[PDB]
């Protein structure tokens, strides 16, 4: 949860382990992470009236 007038700088470290394959299968396989901002007024119509 971000407040009005916050600033965030985010660094993410990941370690993901695939459970054991049978063989070194030939196909590429990307892991990815995407971040989104969602204002509360987009998810509840009464958010402004609550405030």
């Amino acid at each position: 949860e971000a407040l009005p007038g916050d600033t965030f700088h985010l660094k993410t470290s990941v370690l993901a382990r695939l459970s054991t394959p049978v063989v070194p299968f030939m196909d590429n396989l990307r892991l990815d992470i995407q971040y989104f901002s969602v204002p509360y007024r987009l998810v509840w119509d009464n958010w402004q009236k609550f405030n």
Binding site: L3, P4, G5, P39, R41, Q48, N51
Partner: protein, 52 residues
């Protein structure tokens, strides 16, 4: 019969009553449109376009 019973005042209850009054006074003085709340309770100048 037919009185109203109220507990002893904790200092925590009393300071919460003061800070609630400060909040409602900031709302009266500052305004209560969502942009006025943001500008009065926080340092932030929101663009009008992103708040519809």
């Amino acid at each position: 019969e037919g009185g109203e019973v109220v507990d002893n005042l904790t200092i925590n209850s009393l300071r919460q009553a003061f800070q609630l009054q400060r909040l409602l006074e900031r709302d009266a003085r500052g305004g209560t449109r969502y942009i006025e709340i943001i500008r009065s309770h926080f340092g932030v100048i929101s663009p009008d376009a992103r708040v519809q």
